[PDB]
Write a protein that binds this ligand. Structure first.
Ligand code: HEM
Ligand code: HEM
Lengths: 137, 137
């Protein structure tokens, strides 16, 4: 289920974070508007970039904590406020987060593994609602 | 406290895992008998090896899960058995883990951060006696 998936991702976080983030960027190429240092590079080139590895790790480290702190896939208000008020998230709207989780759930559904895809869909939709409530457009 | 330290470490897991694992190897150089592939390499060389970082990341993820599951810094007997029964752990005594946590606590005390060093000291002692219970010599 959802709690076990959190442990699965944490067990190999580097690989999942990189693979899921790449699925996001390849499914929604226009999202590189936000990460212009990743333009013009293949997956293998991104995976050898220090900055890419560090960013994906810290994103998914934090995403797994937000997931771990949720109840029934509903994230804490404090966690959403953190995400809205991060300096690095200044320009973003909820549609950006929706697309990350669409790609994440698609990655799980295409995986050989028994991820609780439906739970992560709910988590994504509940996080977006939480971010709206904390002020994200 | 202990719970917040878990979140602090998870937030930047690979960086804390490498620094702590390095402080352990450097405090107890004999312990490299167990990691032959790290012999003859400075900290910076080890930090450049993807395999070194992958190992430290998986170790400290599991350590943070055993920590998160503990009650009042008392690990589950089941986790202690898992760590004894791992094949990679075949032939270790509790002195090996005792030394890891001494280096971990010393690292925290020297940090400029308000880690709850005493809790980690107790978690390490309680893990060591739990590995003893679960059959480690
Ligand atoms: C959904 C869960 C998300 C989490 C947990 C998360 C977390 C993070 C973290 C930890 C950082 C690093 C901040 C630092 O270095 O202190 C970061 C940076 C950043 N995030 Fe996110 N983020 C999420 C979603 C998104 C989305 C959907 C976008 C855009 C589509 C985005 C855009 C950015 C940008 C542009 C930066 C910093 C610029 C850079 O990479 O140098 N984030 N985020
Ligand atoms: C709470 C403490 C510890 C935890 C959570 C832990 C966890 C792990 C994990 C998850 C792995 C597998 C990593 C992978 O799959 O890549 C591993 C491997 C290993 N561990 Fe530990 N460990 C701990 C303490 C120790 C100590 C104190 C020693 C020896 C001083 C040790 C010796 C080893 C060795 C030799 C390997 C195999 C390394 C290799 O294949 O290159 N472990 N440990």
């Amino acid at each position: 289920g959802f709690k076990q998936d959190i442990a699965t991702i944490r067990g190999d976080l580097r690989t999942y974070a990189q693979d899921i983030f790449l699925a996001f960027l390849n499914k929604y190429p226009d999202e590189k508007r936000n990460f212009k240092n990743y333009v013009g590079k293949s997956d293998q080139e991104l995976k050898s970039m220090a900055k890419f590895g560090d960013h994906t790790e810290k994103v998914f480290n934090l995403m797994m904590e937000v997931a771990d702190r949720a109840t029934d896939c509903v994230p804490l208000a404090s966690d959403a406020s953190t995400l809205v008020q991060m300096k690095q998230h200044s320009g973003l709207t909820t549609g950006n987060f929706e697309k990350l989780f669409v790609a994440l759930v698609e990655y799980m559904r295409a995986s050989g593994q028994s991820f609780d895809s439906q739970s992560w869909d709910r988590f994504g939709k509940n996080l977006v609602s939480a971010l709206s409530s904390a002020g994200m457009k």
